[PDB]
């Protein structure tokens, strides 16, 4: 429910979302705690359940580049679930936070049983890709 | 190894192993067009990906003025309607055979049986799509400034 | 160094061009909580923040404000509205007391009429943004 | 629009006298079928408007794959942003027919703006709109 309040999982039914929740782990942050640092290995997504999380980078002059504030029911590290890679930002608790995490290693076991879910996940991610490279302009003019 | 190389010269199936490529190939259907045949019409329901194996397909779209604007010319080893395999929806272009064309097609409907036979494929397909969506959004403009 | 030249748009201006741009601008002071502009307001003005911080936010489909950026000293707001006026797509709010320098689209032609090297510099800067875009970036 | 110059978003704002001047200040270029206008990677500093004939733009892929990109006909622009920000040609241009073009180079820009100072804001609007609608399309940030 908190879990289906995002486009990735918004297509799941009660049974499927109940199973997803049981595949996930509970994560707690105190205010000011770091969830991860830019460049850390990332192989998991989070759904925020309560509190707020800040994502930033830092410019070569030393100034914070503030990228987002992620609140209840929003995703962190969505694409890490499918394609693990270095974190592109540092995540920092602004408040007492609760999240649910799903790791890349938990993906295959969840999907082995449920190929109905794999297709729903593929539809979700492909919907997003569709709009991106469509928007991603022309210059087919040899500028 | 070189068996299904034609199916791997693209950002979707590039990482498939030889066995997965064999399953992909067995799952596909052969299509052959004569010159001037239309593969599909813009606006048609679309739920298939194609890999052209010979000939050329011109993709085109109807102009605000009634003419067809050229969009692409697709030849051997290139894909048509890639994301429609995962997210069926109306065709945004007409594909017209410029020559004798042969293609291999995979439909949305063929995906589930393949994933059921080979569950690792779901993870591999999710990886491939996530990778590109990543490059588009991340490796790539800003102006979060209001204007 | 120069608060106006720490952005890709005006970076290539020399000392005297920056000074004359600055003399052509309007200073704006905001108290904490003041709104610089509302989403949907006519937008025809670029700002450079010179002190404090401005939060840019957009109304989310669920009705919460969604933060797009926080803009600090040396950073731009409304850059493209200087050249191509149109509705503001975000609300800007002062998180602190804020001072800015503003240049409006109405000021642009008076400034450029006698400064063709500046105009060419600005065109290069905008175009380069397009070039690097596509240097980083269908099926039917 | 009958004007071979004002059928594109870049120059579409201009009035009759400023287009005629612009035209007479551009250089005429002639290509025979099979001529190369430019090679992908070549330094570029000018835009062209095709006045007659057709130019194929194609770029080259991993295996050495000549990859078709556009066919540019009369009243259409080639290398638009090369005028403002000279850099490497993103494609090869090959004449499909005998072709005629008008060329405007980066070096012709400052003298033009000296004679016609108000043109600067019209070009800025046009390039900024290209950039804005992109940004408007985009702005589709979670640590990845």
């Amino acid at each position: 429910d908190v879990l289906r309040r995002n486009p990735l999982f918004a297509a799941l039914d009660d049974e499927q979302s109940a199973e997803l929740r049981a595949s996930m782990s509970e994560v707690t942050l105190a205010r000011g705690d770091t969830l991860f640092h830019e460049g850390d290995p990332g192989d998991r997504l989070y759904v925020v359940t309560e509190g707020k999380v800040k994502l930033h980078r830092t410019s070569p002059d030393g100034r914070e580049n503030m990228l987002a504030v992620v609140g209840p029911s929003e995703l962190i590290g969505e694409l890490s679930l499918f394609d693990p890679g270095p974190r592109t930002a540092t995540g920092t608790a602004l408040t007492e936070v609760k999240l649910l995490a799903l790791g890349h290693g938990d993906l295959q076991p969840w999907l082995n049983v449920r190929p109905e879910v794999a297709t729903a996940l593929l539809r979700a991610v492909a919907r997003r890709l569709r709009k991106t490279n469509d928007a991603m302009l022309v210059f087919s003019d040899g500028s």
Side-chain angles (χ1 to χ4, degrees), chain A:
Chain A
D1 162 48
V2 72
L3 288 176
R4 290 186 280 183
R5 224 103 286 195
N6 76 77
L8 184 55
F9 300 143
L12 299 182
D13 71 11
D14 282 18
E15 172 164 319
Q16 300 168 342
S17 70
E19 297 178 304
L20 170 57
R21 171 67 187 87
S23 297
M24 296 174 91
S25 73
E26 290 195 0
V27 177
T28 264
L29 308 171
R31 162 183 253 80
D33 282 8
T34 105
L35 189 55
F36 43 73
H37 286 130
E38 178 184 348
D40 289 353
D43 76 324
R44 78 196 57 233
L45 113 198
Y46 305 84
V47 183
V48 180
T49 285
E50 85 155 357
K52 289 185 168 100
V53 172
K54 171 175 80 156
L55 301 161
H56 87 277
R57 298 173 224 149
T58 305
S59 47
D61 59 10
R63 246 43 69 181
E64 175 186 63
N65 167 39
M66 143 132 259
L67 304 162
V69 169
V70 181
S73 82
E74 301 169 66
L75 290 166
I76 296 161
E78 184 191 347
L79 295 178
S80 333
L81 178 60
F82 307 119
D83 182 43
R87 296 297 191 198
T88 54
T90 292
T92 256
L94 284 174
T95 152
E96 276 266 288
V97 178
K98 291 220 213 183
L99 327 84
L100 289 159
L102 184 60
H104 177 69
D106 304 293
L107 185 62
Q108 194 81 78
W110 179 40
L111 297 189
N112 278 329
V113 196
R114 299 146 198 114
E116 342 98 42
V117 175
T119 47
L121 295 181
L122 281 156
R123 186 184 276 274
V125 179
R127 278 197 283 254
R128 288 196 50 180
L129 193 49
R130 183 168 277 204
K131 290 167 195 183
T132 61
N133 60 35
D134 289 17
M136 143 177 304
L137 297 79
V138 93
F139 307 88
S140 300
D141 78 340
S143 280

mmCIF file of all heavy atoms in Angstrom, chain A residues 53-95:
data_model
loop_
_atom_site.group_PDB
_atom_site.id
_atom_site.type_symbol
_atom_site.label_atom_id
_atom_site.label_comp_id
_atom_site.label_asym_id
_atom_site.label_seq_id
_atom_site.Cartn_x
_atom_site.Cartn_y
_atom_site.Cartn_z
ATOM 1 N N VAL A 53 14.477 11.979 3.699
ATOM 2 C CA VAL A 53 15.883 11.722 3.379
ATOM 3 C C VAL A 53 16.392 12.676 2.294
ATOM 4 O O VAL A 53 15.736 12.859 1.274
ATOM 5 C CB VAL A 53 16.122 10.240 2.905
ATOM 6 C CG1 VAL A 53 17.540 10.040 2.392
ATOM 7 C CG2 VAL A 53 15.789 9.226 4.012
ATOM 8 N N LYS A 54 17.587 13.218 2.499
ATOM 9 C CA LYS A 54 18.162 14.250 1.634
ATOM 10 C C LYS A 54 19.249 13.661 0.755
ATOM 11 O O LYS A 54 20.134 12.974 1.242
ATOM 12 C CB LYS A 54 18.733 15.403 2.493
ATOM 13 C CG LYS A 54 19.552 16.460 1.718
ATOM 14 C CD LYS A 54 19.998 17.638 2.583
ATOM 15 C CE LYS A 54 21.223 17.316 3.410
ATOM 16 N NZ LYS A 54 21.950 18.568 3.771
ATOM 17 N N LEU A 55 19.191 13.928 -0.544
ATOM 18 C CA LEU A 55 20.254 13.471 -1.447
ATOM 19 C C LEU A 55 21.071 14.655 -1.919
ATOM 20 O O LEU A 55 20.491 15.648 -2.351
ATOM 21 C CB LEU A 55 19.674 12.704 -2.641
ATOM 22 C CG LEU A 55 18.854 11.468 -2.261
ATOM 23 C CD1 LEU A 55 17.953 11.051 -3.389
ATOM 24 C CD2 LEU A 55 19.766 10.336 -1.858
ATOM 25 N N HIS A 56 22.403 14.568 -1.815
ATOM 26 C CA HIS A 56 23.277 15.656 -2.280
ATOM 27 C C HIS A 56 24.559 15.183 -2.967
ATOM 28 O O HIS A 56 24.979 14.035 -2.800
ATOM 29 C CB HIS A 56 23.605 16.641 -1.136
ATOM 30 C CG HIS A 56 24.799 16.258 -0.304
ATOM 31 N ND1 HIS A 56 24.725 15.361 0.740
ATOM 32 C CD2 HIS A 56 26.087 16.682 -0.343
ATOM 33 C CE1 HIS A 56 25.920 15.236 1.298
ATOM 34 N NE2 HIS A 56 26.765 16.031 0.663
ATOM 35 N N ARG A 57 25.154 16.088 -3.742
ATOM 36 C CA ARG A 57 26.548 16.008 -4.184
ATOM 37 C C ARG A 57 27.238 17.317 -3.777
ATOM 38 O O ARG A 57 26.567 18.252 -3.334
ATOM 39 C CB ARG A 57 26.644 15.849 -5.704
ATOM 40 C CG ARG A 57 25.999 14.586 -6.275
ATOM 41 C CD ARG A 57 26.024 14.636 -7.816
ATOM 42 N NE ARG A 57 24.747 14.222 -8.416
ATOM 43 C CZ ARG A 57 24.263 14.694 -9.564
ATOM 44 N NH1 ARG A 57 24.942 15.602 -10.261
ATOM 45 N NH2 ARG A 57 23.086 14.269 -10.019
ATOM 46 N N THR A 58 28.558 17.398 -3.968
ATOM 47 C CA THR A 58 29.337 18.590 -3.603
ATOM 48 C C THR A 58 30.208 19.038 -4.760
ATOM 49 O O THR A 58 31.026 18.265 -5.257
ATOM 50 C CB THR A 58 30.225 18.340 -2.373
ATOM 51 O OG1 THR A 58 29.414 17.871 -1.298
ATOM 52 C CG2 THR A 58 30.935 19.615 -1.932
ATOM 53 N N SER A 59 30.084 20.311 -5.149
ATOM 54 C CA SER A 59 30.785 20.884 -6.307
ATOM 55 C C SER A 59 32.224 21.149 -6.011
ATOM 56 O O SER A 59 32.583 21.232 -4.859
ATOM 57 C CB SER A 59 30.147 22.200 -6.762
ATOM 58 O OG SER A 59 29.891 23.086 -5.689
ATOM 59 N N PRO A 60 33.043 21.291 -7.040
ATOM 60 C CA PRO A 60 34.477 21.530 -6.832
ATOM 61 C C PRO A 60 34.856 22.799 -6.050
ATOM 62 O O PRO A 60 36.010 22.939 -5.645
ATOM 63 C CB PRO A 60 35.034 21.571 -8.257
ATOM 64 C CG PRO A 60 34.054 20.807 -9.063
ATOM 65 C CD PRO A 60 32.730 21.159 -8.476
ATOM 66 N N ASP A 61 33.897 23.701 -5.845
ATOM 67 C CA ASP A 61 34.099 24.891 -5.005
ATOM 68 C C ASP A 61 33.806 24.606 -3.530
ATOM 69 O O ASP A 61 34.150 25.396 -2.664
ATOM 70 C CB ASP A 61 33.241 26.073 -5.505
ATOM 71 C CG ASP A 61 31.736 25.756 -5.516
ATOM 72 O OD1 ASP A 61 31.316 24.707 -4.965
ATOM 73 O OD2 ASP A 61 30.962 26.560 -6.076
ATOM 74 N N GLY A 62 33.164 23.478 -3.252
ATOM 75 C CA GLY A 62 32.835 23.094 -1.881
ATOM 76 C C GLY A 62 31.366 23.236 -1.510
ATOM 77 O O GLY A 62 30.951 22.865 -0.413
ATOM 78 N N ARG A 63 30.575 23.794 -2.411
ATOM 79 C CA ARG A 63 29.163 23.997 -2.130
ATOM 80 C C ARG A 63 28.309 22.774 -2.411
ATOM 81 O O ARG A 63 28.462 22.125 -3.445
ATOM 82 C CB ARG A 63 28.619 25.212 -2.884
ATOM 83 C CG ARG A 63 28.201 26.356 -1.978
ATOM 84 C CD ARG A 63 29.207 26.587 -0.860
ATOM 85 N NE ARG A 63 30.469 27.126 -1.363
ATOM 86 C CZ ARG A 63 31.529 27.400 -0.607
ATOM 87 N NH1 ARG A 63 31.492 27.185 0.705
ATOM 88 N NH2 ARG A 63 32.626 27.896 -1.168
ATOM 89 N N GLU A 64 27.414 22.486 -1.468
ATOM 90 C CA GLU A 64 26.430 21.417 -1.580
ATOM 91 C C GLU A 64 25.514 21.619 -2.777
ATOM 92 O O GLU A 64 24.971 22.706 -2.994
ATOM 93 C CB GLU A 64 25.596 21.346 -0.299
ATOM 94 C CG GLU A 64 24.435 20.342 -0.304
ATOM 95 C CD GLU A 64 23.586 20.447 0.954
ATOM 96 O OE1 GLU A 64 22.967 21.515 1.180
ATOM 97 O OE2 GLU A 64 23.542 19.469 1.731
ATOM 98 N N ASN A 65 25.371 20.569 -3.565
ATOM 99 C CA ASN A 65 24.387 20.536 -4.619
ATOM 100 C C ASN A 65 23.268 19.603 -4.166
ATOM 101 O O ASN A 65 23.417 18.378 -4.171
ATOM 102 C CB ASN A 65 25.032 20.066 -5.922
ATOM 103 C CG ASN A 65 24.014 19.710 -6.980
ATOM 104 O OD1 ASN A 65 22.996 20.385 -7.133
ATOM 105 N ND2 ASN A 65 24.285 18.646 -7.721
ATOM 106 N N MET A 66 22.149 20.200 -3.766
ATOM 107 C CA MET A 66 21.048 19.452 -3.167
ATOM 108 C C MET A 66 20.043 18.948 -4.202
ATOM 109 O O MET A 66 19.407 19.724 -4.915
ATOM 110 C CB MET A 66 20.407 20.269 -2.044
ATOM 111 C CG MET A 66 18.906 20.155 -1.896
ATOM 112 S SD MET A 66 18.469 19.852 -0.020
ATOM 113 C CE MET A 66 18.202 17.947 -0.249
ATOM 114 N N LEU A 67 19.910 17.628 -4.270
ATOM 115 C CA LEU A 67 19.255 16.998 -5.409
ATOM 116 C C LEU A 67 17.817 16.554 -5.172
ATOM 117 O O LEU A 67 17.016 16.551 -6.105
ATOM 118 C CB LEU A 67 20.117 15.849 -5.953
ATOM 119 C CG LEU A 67 21.540 16.289 -6.332
ATOM 120 C CD1 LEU A 67 22.441 15.078 -6.425
ATOM 121 C CD2 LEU A 67 21.547 17.075 -7.642
ATOM 122 N N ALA A 68 17.484 16.198 -3.933
ATOM 123 C CA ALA A 68 16.116 15.794 -3.617
ATOM 124 C C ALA A 68 15.863 15.617 -2.135
ATOM 125 O O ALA A 68 16.789 15.462 -1.333
ATOM 126 C CB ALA A 68 15.739 14.506 -4.366
ATOM 127 N N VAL A 69 14.587 15.663 -1.787
ATOM 128 C CA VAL A 69 14.136 15.254 -0.467
ATOM 129 C C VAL A 69 13.075 14.186 -0.713
ATOM 130 O O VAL A 69 12.065 14.431 -1.402
ATOM 131 C CB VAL A 69 13.584 16.440 0.350
ATOM 132 C CG1 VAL A 69 12.881 15.943 1.626
ATOM 133 C CG2 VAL A 69 14.712 17.386 0.709
ATOM 134 N N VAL A 70 13.345 12.995 -0.184
ATOM 135 C CA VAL A 70 12.540 11.815 -0.443
ATOM 136 C C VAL A 70 11.724 11.533 0.812
ATOM 137 O O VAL A 70 12.283 11.294 1.889
ATOM 138 C CB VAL A 70 13.444 10.615 -0.759
ATOM 139 C CG1 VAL A 70 12.601 9.346 -1.065
ATOM 140 C CG2 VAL A 70 14.409 10.949 -1.911
ATOM 141 N N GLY A 71 10.407 11.585 0.667
ATOM 142 C CA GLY A 71 9.495 11.371 1.775
ATOM 143 C C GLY A 71 8.712 10.076 1.680
ATOM 144 O O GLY A 71 8.961 9.266 0.778
ATOM 145 N N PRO A 72 7.762 9.869 2.623
ATOM 146 C CA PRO A 72 6.974 8.643 2.697
ATOM 147 C C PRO A 72 6.335 8.197 1.387
ATOM 148 O O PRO A 72 5.722 9.005 0.664
ATOM 149 C CB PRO A 72 5.931 8.977 3.756
ATOM 150 C CG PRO A 72 6.702 9.894 4.694
ATOM 151 C CD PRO A 72 7.405 10.794 3.721
ATOM 152 N N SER A 73 6.517 6.906 1.108
ATOM 153 C CA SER A 73 6.124 6.200 -0.133
ATOM 154 C C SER A 73 6.980 6.464 -1.394
ATOM 155 O O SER A 73 6.718 5.878 -2.454
ATOM 156 C CB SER A 73 4.615 6.321 -0.426
ATOM 157 O OG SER A 73 4.295 7.545 -1.061
ATOM 158 N N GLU A 74 7.994 7.324 -1.294
ATOM 159 C CA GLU A 74 8.875 7.559 -2.446
ATOM 160 C C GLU A 74 10.099 6.649 -2.443
ATOM 161 O O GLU A 74 10.536 6.166 -1.387
ATOM 162 C CB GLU A 74 9.321 9.011 -2.530
ATOM 163 C CG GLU A 74 8.210 10.017 -2.643
ATOM 164 C CD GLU A 74 8.729 11.422 -2.440
ATOM 165 O OE1 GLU A 74 9.525 11.888 -3.293
ATOM 166 O OE2 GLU A 74 8.371 12.047 -1.420
ATOM 167 N N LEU A 75 10.652 6.441 -3.634
ATOM 168 C CA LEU A 75 11.747 5.502 -3.844
ATOM 169 C C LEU A 75 13.125 6.149 -3.748
ATOM 170 O O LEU A 75 13.309 7.306 -4.132
ATOM 171 C CB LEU A 75 11.623 4.854 -5.228
ATOM 172 C CG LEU A 75 10.505 3.854 -5.523
ATOM 173 C CD1 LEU A 75 10.430 3.677 -7.011
ATOM 174 C CD2 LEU A 75 10.749 2.510 -4.857
ATOM 175 N N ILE A 76 14.089 5.382 -3.245
ATOM 176 C CA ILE A 76 15.494 5.753 -3.328
ATOM 177 C C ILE A 76 16.202 4.602 -4.033
ATOM 178 O O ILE A 76 15.945 3.440 -3.721
ATOM 179 C CB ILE A 76 16.123 5.935 -1.911
ATOM 180 C CG1 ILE A 76 15.467 7.093 -1.165
ATOM 181 C CG2 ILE A 76 17.620 6.154 -1.977
ATOM 182 C CD1 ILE A 76 15.704 7.036 0.337
ATOM 183 N N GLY A 77 17.105 4.920 -4.951
ATOM 184 C CA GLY A 77 17.937 3.914 -5.585
ATOM 185 C C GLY A 77 17.164 2.911 -6.421
ATOM 186 O O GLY A 77 17.587 1.774 -6.570
ATOM 187 N N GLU A 78 16.035 3.334 -6.988
ATOM 188 C CA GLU A 78 15.188 2.439 -7.769
ATOM 189 C C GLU A 78 15.964 1.532 -8.731
ATOM 190 O O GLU A 78 15.825 0.313 -8.689
ATOM 191 C CB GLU A 78 14.109 3.214 -8.553
ATOM 192 C CG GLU A 78 13.173 2.258 -9.286
ATOM 193 C CD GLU A 78 12.264 2.924 -10.271
ATOM 194 O OE1 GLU A 78 12.145 4.158 -10.247
ATOM 195 O OE2 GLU A 78 11.669 2.198 -11.088
ATOM 196 N N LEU A 79 16.780 2.108 -9.598
ATOM 197 C CA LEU A 79 17.422 1.303 -10.638
ATOM 198 C C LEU A 79 18.563 0.387 -10.175
ATOM 199 O O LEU A 79 19.021 -0.482 -10.943
ATOM 200 C CB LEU A 79 17.848 2.170 -11.836
ATOM 201 C CG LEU A 79 16.678 2.816 -12.599
ATOM 202 C CD1 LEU A 79 17.217 3.696 -13.730
ATOM 203 C CD2 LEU A 79 15.670 1.806 -13.132
ATOM 204 N N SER A 80 19.012 0.595 -8.928
ATOM 205 C CA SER A 80 20.038 -0.248 -8.289
ATOM 206 C C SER A 80 19.542 -1.661 -8.089
ATOM 207 O O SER A 80 20.339 -2.602 -8.099
ATOM 208 C CB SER A 80 20.440 0.292 -6.910
ATOM 209 O OG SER A 80 20.247 1.677 -6.852
ATOM 210 N N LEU A 81 18.230 -1.802 -7.868
ATOM 211 C CA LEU A 81 17.608 -3.118 -7.744
ATOM 212 C C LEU A 81 17.889 -4.002 -8.953
ATOM 213 O O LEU A 81 18.066 -5.214 -8.802
ATOM 214 C CB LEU A 81 16.089 -3.004 -7.549
ATOM 215 C CG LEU A 81 15.310 -4.317 -7.459
ATOM 216 C CD1 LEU A 81 15.774 -5.185 -6.274
ATOM 217 C CD2 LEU A 81 13.806 -4.037 -7.386
ATOM 218 N N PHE A 82 17.924 -3.395 -10.141
ATOM 219 C CA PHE A 82 18.013 -4.148 -11.397
ATOM 220 C C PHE A 82 19.415 -4.130 -11.934
ATOM 221 O O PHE A 82 19.855 -5.070 -12.565
ATOM 222 C CB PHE A 82 17.048 -3.578 -12.440
ATOM 223 C CG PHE A 82 15.630 -3.464 -11.944
ATOM 224 C CD1 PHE A 82 14.993 -2.227 -11.875
ATOM 225 C CD2 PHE A 82 14.932 -4.603 -11.551
ATOM 226 C CE1 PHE A 82 13.681 -2.132 -11.411
ATOM 227 C CE2 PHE A 82 13.626 -4.513 -11.090
ATOM 228 C CZ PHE A 82 13.002 -3.272 -11.024
ATOM 229 N N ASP A 83 20.124 -3.044 -11.672
ATOM 230 C CA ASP A 83 21.468 -2.877 -12.202
ATOM 231 C C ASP A 83 22.375 -2.168 -11.173
ATOM 232 O O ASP A 83 22.604 -0.960 -11.253
ATOM 233 C CB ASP A 83 21.401 -2.122 -13.529
ATOM 234 C CG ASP A 83 22.766 -1.954 -14.187
ATOM 235 O OD1 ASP A 83 23.559 -2.923 -14.204
ATOM 236 O OD2 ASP A 83 23.023 -0.844 -14.702
ATOM 237 N N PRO A 84 22.924 -2.939 -10.227
ATOM 238 C CA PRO A 84 23.820 -2.432 -9.192
ATOM 239 C C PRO A 84 24.981 -1.596 -9.756
ATOM 240 O O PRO A 84 25.533 -1.909 -10.808
ATOM 241 C CB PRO A 84 24.346 -3.711 -8.530
ATOM 242 C CG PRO A 84 23.224 -4.708 -8.733
ATOM 243 C CD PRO A 84 22.727 -4.399 -10.117
ATOM 244 N N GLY A 85 25.299 -0.511 -9.064
ATOM 245 C CA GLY A 85 26.380 0.389 -9.474
ATOM 246 C C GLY A 85 26.641 1.368 -8.348
ATOM 247 O O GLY A 85 25.906 1.349 -7.356
ATOM 248 N N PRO A 86 27.707 2.186 -8.467
ATOM 249 C CA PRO A 86 28.058 3.191 -7.460
ATOM 250 C C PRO A 86 26.963 4.233 -7.240
ATOM 251 O O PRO A 86 26.363 4.728 -8.201
ATOM 252 C CB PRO A 86 29.308 3.870 -8.042
ATOM 253 C CG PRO A 86 29.338 3.503 -9.455
ATOM 254 C CD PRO A 86 28.685 2.172 -9.573
ATOM 255 N N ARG A 87 26.693 4.549 -5.974
ATOM 256 C CA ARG A 87 25.707 5.582 -5.643
ATOM 257 C C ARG A 87 26.104 6.898 -6.295
ATOM 258 O O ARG A 87 27.282 7.234 -6.334
ATOM 259 C CB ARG A 87 25.568 5.723 -4.118
ATOM 260 C CG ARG A 87 25.007 4.457 -3.435
ATOM 261 C CD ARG A 87 23.583 4.146 -3.926
ATOM 262 N NE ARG A 87 22.950 3.116 -3.109
ATOM 263 C CZ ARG A 87 21.893 2.402 -3.477
ATOM 264 N NH1 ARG A 87 21.351 2.575 -4.683
ATOM 265 N NH2 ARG A 87 21.398 1.497 -2.642
ATOM 266 N N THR A 88 25.133 7.620 -6.846
ATOM 267 C CA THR A 88 25.417 8.886 -7.532
ATOM 268 C C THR A 88 25.220 10.087 -6.600
ATOM 269 O O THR A 88 25.422 11.236 -6.999
ATOM 270 C CB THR A 88 24.530 9.085 -8.792
ATOM 271 O OG1 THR A 88 23.144 8.947 -8.438
ATOM 272 C CG2 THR A 88 24.880 8.080 -9.864
ATOM 273 N N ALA A 89 24.818 9.815 -5.361
ATOM 274 C CA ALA A 89 24.599 10.865 -4.369
ATOM 275 C C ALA A 89 24.767 10.319 -2.956
ATOM 276 O O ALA A 89 24.651 9.107 -2.733
ATOM 277 C CB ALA A 89 23.202 11.457 -4.524
ATOM 278 N N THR A 90 25.004 11.236 -2.011
ATOM 279 C CA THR A 90 25.002 10.916 -0.598
ATOM 280 C C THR A 90 23.594 11.136 -0.032
ATOM 281 O O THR A 90 22.970 12.167 -0.296
ATOM 282 C CB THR A 90 26.101 11.746 0.165
ATOM 283 O OG1 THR A 90 27.397 11.297 -0.248
ATOM 284 C CG2 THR A 90 26.008 11.559 1.671
ATOM 285 N N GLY A 91 23.094 10.148 0.713
ATOM 286 C CA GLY A 91 21.749 10.193 1.296
ATOM 287 C C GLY A 91 21.868 10.349 2.807
ATOM 288 O O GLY A 91 22.625 9.615 3.451
ATOM 289 N N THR A 92 21.093 11.282 3.353
ATOM 290 C CA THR A 92 21.291 11.786 4.688
ATOM 291 C C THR A 92 19.936 11.984 5.388
ATOM 292 O O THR A 92 19.058 12.651 4.854
ATOM 293 C CB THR A 92 22.116 13.104 4.561
ATOM 294 O OG1 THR A 92 23.474 12.845 4.934
ATOM 295 C CG2 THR A 92 21.545 14.219 5.374
ATOM 296 N N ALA A 93 19.753 11.405 6.571
ATOM 297 C CA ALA A 93 18.467 11.505 7.269
ATOM 298 C C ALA A 93 18.207 12.918 7.803
ATOM 299 O O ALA A 93 19.009 13.461 8.558
ATOM 300 C CB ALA A 93 18.375 10.464 8.404
ATOM 301 N N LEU A 94 17.078 13.505 7.419
ATOM 302 C CA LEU A 94 16.739 14.859 7.858
ATOM 303 C C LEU A 94 15.954 14.792 9.150
ATOM 304 O O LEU A 94 15.862 15.766 9.881
ATOM 305 C CB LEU A 94 15.923 15.602 6.783
ATOM 306 C CG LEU A 94 16.686 16.138 5.570
ATOM 307 C CD1 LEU A 94 15.719 16.719 4.546
ATOM 308 C CD2 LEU A 94 17.737 17.176 5.977
ATOM 309 N N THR A 95 15.437 13.599 9.419
ATOM 310 C CA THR A 95 14.500 13.300 10.498
ATOM 311 C C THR A 95 14.788 11.871 10.916
ATOM 312 O O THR A 95 15.608 11.202 10.268
ATOM 313 C CB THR A 95 13.048 13.357 9.916
ATOM 314 O OG1 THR A 95 12.159 12.504 10.645
ATOM 315 C CG2 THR A 95 13.066 12.826 8.576
#
